[PDB]
Write a protein that binds this ligand. Sequence first.
Ligand SMILES: [Mg+2]
Lengths: 88, 1096, 95, 52, 57, 170, 114
Amino acid sequence: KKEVRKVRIALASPEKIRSWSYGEVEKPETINYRTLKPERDGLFDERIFGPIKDTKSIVRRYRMGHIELATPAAHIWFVKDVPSKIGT
Amino acid sequence: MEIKRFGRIREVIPLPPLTEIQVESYRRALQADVPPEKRENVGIQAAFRETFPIEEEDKGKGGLVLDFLEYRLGEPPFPQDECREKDLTYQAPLYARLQLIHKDTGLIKEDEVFLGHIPLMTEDGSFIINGADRVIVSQIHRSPGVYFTPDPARPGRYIASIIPLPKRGPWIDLEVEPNGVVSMKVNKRKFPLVLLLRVLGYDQETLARELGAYGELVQGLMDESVFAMRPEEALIRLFTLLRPGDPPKRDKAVAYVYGLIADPRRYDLGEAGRYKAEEKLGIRLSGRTLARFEDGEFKDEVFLPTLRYLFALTAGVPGHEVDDIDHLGNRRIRTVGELMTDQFRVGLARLARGVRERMLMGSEDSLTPAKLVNSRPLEAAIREFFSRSQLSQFKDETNPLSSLRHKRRISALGPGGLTRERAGFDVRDVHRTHYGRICPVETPEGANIGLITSLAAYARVDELGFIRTPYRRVVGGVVTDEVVYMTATEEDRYTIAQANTPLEGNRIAAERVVARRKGEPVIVSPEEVEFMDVSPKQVFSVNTNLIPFLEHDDANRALMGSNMQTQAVPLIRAQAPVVMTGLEERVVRDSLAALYAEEDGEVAKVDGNRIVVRYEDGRLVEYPLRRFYRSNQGTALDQRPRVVVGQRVRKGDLLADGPASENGFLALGQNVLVAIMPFDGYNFEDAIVISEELLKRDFYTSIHIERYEIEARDTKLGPERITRDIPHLSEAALRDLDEEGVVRIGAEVKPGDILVGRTSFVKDTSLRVPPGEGGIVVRTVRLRRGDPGVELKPGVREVVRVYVAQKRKLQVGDKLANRHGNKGVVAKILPVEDMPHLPDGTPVDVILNPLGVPSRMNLGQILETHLGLAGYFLGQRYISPIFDGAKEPEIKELLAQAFEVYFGKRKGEGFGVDKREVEVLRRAEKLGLVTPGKTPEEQLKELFLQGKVVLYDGRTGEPIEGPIVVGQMFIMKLYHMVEDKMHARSTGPYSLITQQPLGGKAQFGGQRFGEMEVWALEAYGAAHTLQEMLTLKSDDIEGRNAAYEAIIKGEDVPEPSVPESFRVLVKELQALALDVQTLDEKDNPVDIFEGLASKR
Amino acid sequence: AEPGIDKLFGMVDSKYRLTVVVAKRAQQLLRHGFKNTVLEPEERPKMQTLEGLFDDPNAVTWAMKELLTGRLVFGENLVPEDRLQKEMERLYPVE
Amino acid sequence: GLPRVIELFEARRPKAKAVISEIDGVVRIEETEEKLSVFVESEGFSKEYKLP
Amino acid sequence: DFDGDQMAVHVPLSSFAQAEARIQMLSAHNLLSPASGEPLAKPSRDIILGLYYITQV
Amino acid sequence: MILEAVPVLPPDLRPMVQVDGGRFATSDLNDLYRRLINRNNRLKKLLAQGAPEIIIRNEKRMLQEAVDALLDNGRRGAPVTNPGSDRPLRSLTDILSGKQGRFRQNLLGKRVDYSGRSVIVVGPQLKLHQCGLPKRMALELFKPFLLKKMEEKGIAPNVKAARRMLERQR
Amino acid sequence: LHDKHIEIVVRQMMKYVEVTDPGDSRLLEGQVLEKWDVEALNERLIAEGKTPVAWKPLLMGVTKSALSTKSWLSAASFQNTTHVLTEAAIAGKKDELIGLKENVILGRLIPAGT
Ligand SMILES: [Mg+2]
C-alpha cells in the first residue's frame, strides 16, 4: 500500500539470486515442435515460472529462476568499464 | 479572344528541348544503338576496355588473354506495356564478343554471351524496373582538376592540390614549408617532391635551371642531392618510403598504381583534367592523368607545371592564379549514363575476379564460354543500382509541366562524397555564376533549400556537366543576333549587356547601358559589352518563366509560386491563363501531353481511343488515344480529341491536347472572376471564399484512381483460399463479391466492403474496402498460380490487383493558390444567392482576404487581377513577357476600352448611374478617390481605370463602400495530398511486440502523440488525464479494454496499475547482477509485485 | 464560461482544490447513482431538446452548481475515508 | 546573436573576451607599440594586463 | 496558417480526466501568456482593421 | 561482485511467438541461454570425466565468454545466431540501451488510440469556447458512448447489435 | 519576458560548489551547495566540532550541470546506462523520487498539477 518515494540500486548475492529464483533451468529445452508446451524444466518450464493458463502467466513473466554455473563468472561490465572497477 | 502580347523582345533563338539530359546520358552511355564500331565508347565499351582484359600471364600456366571485340543488345524482351501489366523490366540482352588466347598455339573465342539484361530507357527517360518505371537524377561535384587555396593555418603561403576520382586513390597535395620541406602527400604521408621528380627523369640541374629560373624555393629541391644522383634508385627509395613490409625492389610496381587506370582519374583527356590543366596550370595533357610506363621512366606534364605554379603564385604574378571553390566554372555535373557505366565497370571487375580464378582452376583451355563467363554478378549489380540504389525514385506524374521540371532539375547531394547534407550554407547562397546558369527561385524550400534547382531555361550542358548560356553578341555599337553559349568561366572575360536595353536593331538605343562585366552592374557605354543578354528567359529555368508579372513580386514567394506550379492536378476543365508568358505552347510541345501531327495531312478517323491520320505525303498512320490512364498518384491521362474527322492538319499540328492542355495550351486549374475584399472571417489570413457556381458548373474536379491489391498464400497451417465464404454469420454482403474470391466490376464501394475473399486457418481472412472512400470498380487482375510471365512470391498462392475510380469534385477543405505565389485553402462556398454581385448581375467567383498581399511582396498578382478583369469584357487574352511585357499605360488604355464597352451597353440598356452609384461616388470624392465635379459617368470611368468599381451586396444587397479591383484570375488547385484525409481511429489493432495501438489497413490507426505534447500537458496540471493517455490510451491492453467495457456499461473507468513497462524494466534490472529496491518514505522496501514475486 | 467561477474561486482556497472538489463531487454523482445531489429538485440543470439535463447530461455542471450552494462541504482531510464510503453506501441505494 | 545566448548558458570562453579588472584599484596603461601593458594599480601592487 | 498543415486531436476519458482537461486546459480558461504575462488572445488583423476604421474620424 | 548464479528471464518476457506454419520467432535471449546451458553442461561432464587442463581452460573461456555475451554482445567479437545472418543477437545491454531501447521505449510511450489528425478550417462562427468538428470523426471516436446511448435508446437491440448497426455507413 | 524565468534558470545552473576544506568527506568534491550548507549545519550546528566544509561555488556548464546530476535515472538517460548503473551499483544508491523525469518513467504523478 506504500507509495514509492525512493528507489535503491544495490548489488546481488548468488544466495540472493536464489532469494527470488524459482528453481534453476539446466537443459535449454524451449519446446518440441509437436508438443508446444514448455518441454522440460527448461528455459520456459511452467512450474519454475508459473501457470501458462489463467494466476495466469503474469507470474511466469515475474517469477524467475536461476542457473548455477559450476565455474563462477565475472560481470563483464565491472572489467570492461573504462575504469575497470575490479582492476582498479 | 485575341492574344495581345506586350513584351517586345526579339528572341533570336527559341527554347531548346528540355529532357535530352536523361536521354543522351543513357543514349550516349550505350553506343550499341549504333554499330559497336561506332566511336562512342562511354558506358559499355569504356568498361569493357577497363575490366574486360583479364590476364593471367605467369601463374602456373598463363597466357590467359580474353579480349573483347563487339558488344550489342537490341531487344526489349517484353513490351513496356506488358512490362507494366506484368511487373517485367524493359531491357535489352547485351552480348559481349570475346576471344581467348593463350601462350599455346590456339585461340578459343567464345563470341556472344547475353551478359547484362540492361533495362532500356523509356522514351520519356524512365526505366521499367518491375511493372513500374523510375527515373534517375543527376548531381554536382568538384570538377576533377587542379586547384589552389591559401594554407588554412598558414595564410602567407597557399597550397595546391590534385583531385583524382574515384575516391580510392591518392589525393595529391603540394605545399612548401620553407624551412627545408617540400611536402607532397598522396593519401596521408608527406614526401619531398624532388625525389619523385628525379624518379621521373628530372635532374636537379635542369629542375633548378627552368624552375629556380624565376622562383626562390627551387633550392628546396636541390637540397636532397643525395637522392638526386640516383634517378631509378630514387624509385626504389620511394617504395622504401612506402613501409608496407614489402621489398623496395619493384621497378614500377606501385608506379602503375600511380599511373592512369586505377588511382589517377580517367576524366576525359582534354577538358576533364586538361582544361583544368591546360587552363589553370600546365599546357598539354599527354594521357588524362599522370602515366608513363612504356620505358620504366615516367612523364608527368602536370607536376612540373604544378610546381611552376606554386613558384609563380608564391613569388610572382604570371597570372591571376587563384582558383575559386564555389565558382560554378570549376564545379561539374554528373549524368545518369555515368552511373550506368560505373556500376557496369564494377560488375565487369567482379566478373574479371571470378573468370581469373576459374581460368587457373580451368585445367584445359576449353573454358572460355562458361568457365570464364558468368553474368550473375554484374547482372545483379545492375539490378542493385537501378532498384537498390536510392538515387532514382518515382517520377513526378503530377502534370506534364511538373514532370518536365522534375526531369530537368539538378541537386547537390548524392552518394555523399560529392556533397552530403550537413554543409551547404556556402553552397546554398546563389553564386554569381548562376546567372544564365541556375534559376535561384526554383530551389526546393526547406532543409534542402539551396540543394536542388532547375538550370537556366536557355542554358544547357555543352559537353561535361558545364552549363553554357545563350548571349547576344554585341560588336561595338552593333549587337549581333548570333548567340554564343558561354562557359561560366569564360563569362567573366566580357561585359554582358542586359536585354532590357532598347535598341534600334543591331545597334543599342542608349549610350549609358548597364552590363554584366563580371557579375556586377557596370553602367558603361554600348561599346563596352561583348555580349548582351539574349532574353530574361535564359536567366531562369522553365518553371520560373510561367508567372507573367514577376517584375512586381518578391522572390520569397516567387519560389513558392514556381514550386506550387508543379503540384497542379490536371482538371476536368482545362483553362489557359487570361494573361500568359508565352511558353504554354512550347510547354505542351516539349511536354508530350497532347498529340501533334507529324506533317501536313487530313483526318482519316478520330475515335475516342484512336486517330488514323492521312498525311499529305499520301501515307496514313493511326495513333491510339489515351482515354483514362492512372498517374503515379492516381489521376486521369487523356489527350483531348481536338480534331474532327477529315480535318486537314499540318506538320507538328497538335492532335489531341494532353490532360491539362486547353488548345495546345497549358490549361490546368481555372480562370475565375475574383474580388479582393476582407469578408467576415472566411478570408481570414489566406482563406479563400468561393461562390457556389463553380460547383454548379463542372469547373473544378478530377478523377482519383485507387489501386488496391491482395493475395492468397499456402500457409503451412493451410493455404489461404481466396473465396467468397464468410463462415460465421452473414451472406448478404457477399452478393457484391460476385465471382468466387474476385469481386464484380463497375460498382460503388462503401467503407468496410469486402474486396477479395479468403480464409485462413478454416478462419475467414479476406480483403475488404479500406476505410475512407472508394469509388467505382474499374479493373481487376488475377494472377493465380497460373503465372504466365509473373513470379508470385514464395508462399503467395496467388495475387490479385483491383482498380477503383472516384470522380473527386472540389469540396470544402480543398486548397488553391495563384501563379503569383499567394496560397490558401478554400474556407467556405457561399450560396451565390446573397453573395456580392456587380451592378451587372454577373458576380465574382472568389473573394480573397487582402491583408495577405501587403505582408507578401507581390504586385504582379494585382496587375494580373487588372489584366484579367479587362480581358473579361475584352473577351480576349494577352501575352506578357516577365519584364518586357505589358505596361500600366496600356493597362489604363484597356481599362478605358473595357469600361466604355461595359457602360455603353449599360446605357443602351436605358440606364446610366443609380443613386447607389452617385452616393458611393460622392463618398469617393470625400476620400478624394474621385475628383469632385466630374461626371458620375466620368468619375466611374476613372474608377474603372483605377481597376476598382462599385459592387452590390446580395444579402443586404447594398452597394459596397470603396471601389474594389477584381479580375479573371487563373487560380490552380494544389496537391490535396493524403494529409487531407481524416486519420481518425478510436479502437482497433495493436502492435505485436508492444501493445501500442496500430491499425492502418483495417482501422485508421492511432495518432502519433510525441513528447513535447506531454511536455505541454506537464505545463498544465494534467495528472490523471495524462495517466489515462499513457495507460488507458497508450499501452495497457487490459486497462484499455476495461475502460472499453466501463464505457459500454457507462460506469466510472477503473484504476490504472503501476506502469508495467516500469515493472518490466525492474525485472530486467534484477535479471542482470543489478538489484533494485523501492524505498518507503523512510528507507524501506515497498513491493510492486504484490504476491507475484515472493517465492511460495 | 462558467457561472460564479469568481465566487467559487473565493470560496476555494486553491484553483486545483476547486478542480479536485468538482471532480470528486462529479464522480460521487456518478458512482452512487446520480442521486448524489443537493440542489436538484427546484432549480436544476436542464436540457434543450427536453429536460434531460435534470438527470446527468454533464455532471460537472451539477458539481459546480452545488458548490455555488453551501450545501456541500469539501474537506481536504475532513472525514475518515472508510466510514465516509461506508455511510455513502448504506444511505444511497441509488448505486 | 543566438550563439551569444547559446554560450551564455554553457559556461565557456568567449572568443572576443575582454580583460576584466583583476584588482579593484585605478588603471595605468603603458601604451607600448606592440601591446599595451595596462595595470590595475593600487596602493599595494599593479595587475598586468597585456592588451593586444 | 492555412497553407495546408493539418492538426490532430485526442480526448480525456475519465470523469476526473475530463474535469481536469476542461478546468485548466480550456482555451477560454487559458487567456494570458504564462511565459510572460502578455495575453495570448491578441485580436487579429481583420477585426483590428474593422474597429480602427469604425472609430476613425 | 562477480557472477555465479545467473537468474533466468521469466518466460513470456523473451516471447516465442508462432509466426505461421510452424516457424518460431524467439527473442534472442533464449538463443544465448541455450548456448550457456550447453556450455555449463559440458563443463560438468568433463569435470566428472577427466581433467585435460588445456581443454578445461578452453571450456572455462567459452563459459565466461558466453556469460559476457549474454550480458553484452559485441564487447569481445560479435556473436550472432546460426548461419543466415551476421546480426549479433540483442543482448541485455542491447535490450536496455540503444537509440530505440528499453530506456528510450519505456519513458515515452508514443501511441494513443483515441487520436486523429486532418486538415483544419476556420470557425468564424465558432467561439473559442467550442470547436468545429466534422461529425464523421467523432463517430468512430465515440463509438463506445454512441452504442452506450443508442442502447440507452432503442436504436439497436444490444450493444453488439449496435456494433453491427453502426459498422456500415448505410 | 518577466525576469523570474532567468532567475530560476541561473539559480538552478549554479547550485553546486566544490569543497576546499574536507569535513566528513574530501575537500575535492563539487556538488549541491544546498547540500553543502545543510552539511555545514550538520557538522557545526547539529554536530559539535567545527569541521568546516570550505568550498568555492562552481561555475559549471549548464550542459555539465545537468550531466552533473544526482538521480541515476536521468543520469542513465543518454550516455551509457552501463557505466551509469556501474556507479549506481558500486555504491548502494538511494535515488529519491525527485525531478520530473524519473518521476515520469515510474509513471508517478509529477508533484505539480494536482
Ligand atoms: Mg502553414
